[PDB]
Write a protein that binds this DNA or RNA. Sequence first.
RNA 1: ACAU
DNA 2: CGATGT
Length: 135
Amino acid sequence: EEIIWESLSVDVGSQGNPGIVEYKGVDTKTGEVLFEREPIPIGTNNMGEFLAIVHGLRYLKERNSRKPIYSDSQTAIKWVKDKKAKSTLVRNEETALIWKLVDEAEEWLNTHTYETPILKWQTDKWGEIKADYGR
RNA sequence: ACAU
DNA sequence: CGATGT
Ligand SMILES: [Cl-]
Ligand SMILES: [Cl-]
Ligand SMILES: [Cl-]
Ligand SMILES: [Mg+2]
Ligand SMILES: [Mg+2]
Ligand SMILES: [Rb+]
Ligand SMILES: [Rb+]
Ligand SMILES: [Rb+]
Ligand SMILES: [Rb+]
Ligand SMILES: [Rb+]
């Protein structure tokens, strides 16, 4: 209903899907960029959205922050809830990097705890998430 | 259909 | 137009 401005927002950016994947996290209130992942040569939009949330979890945990995370990705929110990224992307030599990061993110979720609420950014009511790439 |  | 997902 109301934006929780005291929060972290994350988003993926890509060149192609599958294609070059990156992601970032911003302070919802100000747009300040808090983290950015170096581009990964081949991945999917949803793998990037998933990695972005998990990185946000790890970022806030390290800083003892109880802020929620906003994502616009129905898929990635569910994957994080399940601790399982159900991606269709073929596992081969050229997707090995994205799949390593996805596998490592699942592994982190399965060995750590957090109470961070992971919230759906309501794009239809609020406009584009503040972490959007503008592509 | 909804979310990207 | 195409692709990723529930
Ligand atoms: Cl990552
Ligand atoms: Cl909350
Ligand atoms: Cl959701
Ligand atoms: Mg997004
Ligand atoms: Mg976006
Ligand atoms: Rb901590
Ligand atoms: Rb967008
Ligand atoms: Rb965009
Ligand atoms: Rb969106
Ligand atoms: Rb579809």
